[PDB]
Design a protein around this ligand. Structure first.
Ligand SMILES: CCNC(=O)c1ccc(NS(C)(=O)=O)cc1
Ligand SMILES: [Zn+2]
Ligand SMILES: [Zn+2]
Ligand SMILES: [Zn+2]
Length: 572
């Protein structure tokens, strides 16, 4: 009941009872909150409420201290003090940004902007408030009850009337009734049980609404610049493979934390694993938000680091199949590979946090809270995709507001930049370099002359709000009959429903742009499907076309992005 003010750190007994997270406010700050917002309930040891029997006055501005107790104007004794006076709320030990964070519904981009341009304590209140709000919004969706079971991969669902139906992709994971987590995709709907269970009729599904725990650690610890490599011991015997990164590896050792911007295929994993070879005795925790990113770091480790000094940390509530070739759940191994949400409370000489564009300020905080480290290294690319903000419907979130790390990389620049793409044909490297990298990304590969674009708006149908463009899929089908080397292509679109249709008609494997991030394929076919903010987003577009190692076909809806593709154009 007695703590420190979230704005100025001053001691007080005051918490805002109106704020969903009930944050400590000092007398000066608590006043400035209640006087300029609809927030009027103050909490102490006891609520600031009129103590007169049957009185309903809870608004601190209308209340007085008489003796040791509180009363309104109607009930206060002659000798009483207003609780709100001289810019203060009476409490023990006697802001425009805090008010917007406390009261916003998180549906506007401006809300996320403010949560990332504010002071460090307000980043934490914002992150916890946002996350709390995101969780309570899951409760709003309807229960999904199994009407009938068709097959091992398809059933028919019945949806609770009076509540809306959640989007049916992989981004929305359900819990069966506890018969294991389940996902659904498009009457016949396709089910996927994590645990292989004989799906019974009447069993129901609900989105997991986990309680949002307080935060405590900053998103970033304060920066420290050292004169010499601190707490780490280099080799004088580094493999030529990692020679290029030695100066950057020395920078990692001479700062508290460092940022690395690595555009697609520029050697991020190679850098991360190479850090262990350069500081061979250092204990390194490798972390990312997703099991995929952590597995990708494991695959690289398997090739270059001693397998007996690596462990893959898997939570006992295992949701996806992940990396099997390390000792599982040996926290004390030199090399620990673990999702942010599963991190143990431990220490490390180096923490490597990968795919940083996908992290929230909540994730950055948790990592600082669970891991006490000599050095923190943040790897990714703010020109790639952020974590989906399920509440944000109005405005676009710019890369400089993704999290504290992306904000530094977009403002003062990253500490280190991997400048040569070794994955993509020059046509793709030249396009994205100009689009999101200020012409600083260089091609290693030649032009493949297997990069084509076709401008074809087609016809846009919708499966609810998910878009479909059958004529664009028809153009692809026609191209495949004339280009049989592309039979092996991965089909990519900004929409699951487009992918579902392409799957049946083309038989190609299928990938959303968001699910494709971190992966690479010889040949990619991309149908833009629609001209929307979603489908024209330059980060999404960057990821989409940089998946390709040899060839890409882009069927485009947007003139601007069509014209910027430095590709051979096809007719029909
Ligand atoms: C060293 C203590 N940490 C902080 O500075 C802090 C932690 C959480 C916050 N979020 S809350 C409870 O929702 O206000 C705010 C500030
Ligand atoms: Zn409040
Ligand atoms: Zn204060
Ligand atoms: Zn009263």
């Amino acid at each position: 009941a007695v703590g420190a003010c979230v704005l100025c750190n001053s001691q007080t007994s005051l918490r805002c009872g109106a704020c969903i997270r009930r944050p400590f406010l000092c007398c000066k700050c608590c006043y400035d909150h209640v006087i300029s917002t609809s927030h009027k309930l103050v909490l102490s040891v006891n609520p600031y409420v009129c103590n007169a029997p049957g009185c309903d006055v809870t608004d601190v501005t209308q209340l007085y201290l008489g003796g040791m107790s509180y009363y309104c104007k109607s009930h206060k004794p002659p000798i009483s003090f207003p609780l709100c006076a001289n810019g203060q709320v009476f409490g023990l030990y006697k802001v425009t940004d805090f008010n917007a964070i406390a009261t916003c519904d998180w549906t506007n981009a401006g809300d996320y902007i403010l949560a990332n341009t504010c002071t460090e304590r307000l980043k934490l209140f914002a992150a916890e408030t946002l996350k709390a709000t995101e969780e309570t919004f899951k409760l709003s969706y309807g229960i999904a009850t199994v009407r009938e079971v068709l097959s091992d991969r398809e059933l028919h669902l019945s949806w609770e009337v009076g509540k809306p139906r959640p989007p049916l992709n992989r981004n929305y994971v359900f819990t069966g009734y506890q018969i294991g987590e389940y996902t659904f995709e498009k009457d016949a709907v396709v089910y996927r049980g994590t645990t292989t269970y004989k799906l019974n009729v009447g069993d129901y599904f609900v989105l997991t609404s986990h309680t949002v725990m307080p935060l405590s650690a900053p998103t970033l610890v304060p920066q420290e610049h050292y004169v010499r490599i601190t707490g780490l011991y280099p080799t004088l015997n580094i493999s030529d493979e990692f020679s290029s990164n030695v100066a950057n590896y020395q920078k990692v050792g001479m700062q508290k934390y460092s940022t690395l911007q690595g555009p697609p295929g520029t050697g991020k994993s190679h850098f991360a694993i190479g850090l262990a070879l350069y500081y061979p005795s250092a204990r390194i925790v490798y972390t990312a938000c997703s099991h995929a990113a952590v597995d990708a770091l494991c695959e690289k480790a398997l090739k270059y680091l001693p397998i007996d000094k690596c462990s893959r940390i898997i939570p006992a509530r295992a949701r996806v199949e992940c990396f099997d070739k390390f000792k599982v759940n040996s926290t004390l191994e030199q090399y620990v590979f673990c999702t942010v949400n599963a991190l143990p409370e431990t220490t490390a000489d180096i923490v490597v946090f990968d795919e940083i564009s996908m992290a929230t300020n909540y994730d950055l905080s948790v990592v600082n809270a669970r891991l006490r480290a000599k050095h923190y290294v943040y790897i990714g690319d703010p020109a790639q995709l952020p974590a989906p903000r399920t509440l944000l419907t109005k405005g676009t979130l710019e890369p400089e507001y993704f999290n504290s790390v992306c904000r530094l990389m977009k403002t003062i620049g990253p500490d280190m930049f991997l400048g040569t793409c070794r994955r993509c044909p020059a046509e793709i490297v030249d396009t994205v370099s100009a689009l999101v990298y200020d012409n600083k990304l260089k091609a290693h590969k030649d032009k493949s002359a297997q990069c084509f674009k076709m401008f074809y708006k087609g016809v846009i149908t919708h499966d609810v709000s998910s878009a479909i463009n059958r004529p664009q899929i028809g153009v692809v089908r026609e191209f495949l009959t004339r280009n049989p080397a592309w039979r092996k292509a991965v089909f990519i679109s900004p929409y699951n429903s487009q992918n579902a249709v392409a799957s049946k008609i083309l038989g190609l494997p299928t990938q959303t742009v968001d699910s494709s991030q971190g992966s690479e394929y010889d040949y990619v076919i991309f149908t833009q499907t629609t001209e929307t903010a979603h489908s024209c987003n330059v980060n999404r577009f960057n990821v989409a076309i940089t998946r390709a190692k040899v060839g890409i076909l882009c069927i485009m809806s947007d003139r601007d992005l069509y014209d910027k593709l430095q590709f051979t154009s096809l007719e029909i």
